[PDB]
Amino acid sequence: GANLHLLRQKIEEQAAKYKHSVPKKCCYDGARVNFYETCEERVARVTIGPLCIRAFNECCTIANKIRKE
Predict the structure, then answer these.
(1) H-type alpha helices, 1-69
(2) 39: exposed, middle or buried (Cβ count in 10 Å: 0-12, 13-18, 19+)
(3) Is the CB of residue 63 less than 8 Å from the CB of residue 31?
(4) Are 39 and 57 a contacting pair, CB within 8 Å?
(5) Fewer CB within 10 Å, N side or C side of the chain?
(6) Counting beta carbons within 10 angstroms of the beta carbon of residue 33, is it exposed (0 to 12), middle (13 to 18) or buried (19 or more)?
(7) Are 14 and 59 in contact (CB under 8 A)?
(8) Cβ neighbours for 25, distance < 8 A, ≥ 6 positions apart
(9) How many whole angstroms separate alpha carbon 55 and alpha carbon 51?
(10) Are the beta carbons of 18 and 50 closer than 8 angstroms?
């Protein structure tokens, strides 16, 4: 199915753009598969902080786009 190799390396590239651990983890969390909600739906649930929200949304978007194709 989806290129999971590419998936992991693209997410790691994105998490590396963040300075601190928590936004990195928000990235990895956003990148996890969710069959029932879009990335906007999912990130709308998160209120930890602006940088966490941004990383979550960015990595979700990256992950789902890779899955889509």
Answers:
(1) 4-15, 21-30, 39-43, 50-68
(2) buried
(3) yes
(4) yes
(5) N
(6) exposed
(7) yes
(8) none
(9) 6
(10) no
Domain segments of the chain: what residues? Answer: 1-69
- The resolution in Å comes to 2.1
CA-nearest of 32, 25, 41, 18 to 63 is 32
Tokens 């930890």 correspond to 48
Contact 39, 61 (CB under 8 A): yes
Contact predicate 29/61, CB 8 Å? no
Experiment used for this model: X-ray
Which CATH code of 1.20.91.20, 3.30.2350.10, 2.102.10.10, 3.90.550.10 fits the domain covering 1-69?
1.20.91.20
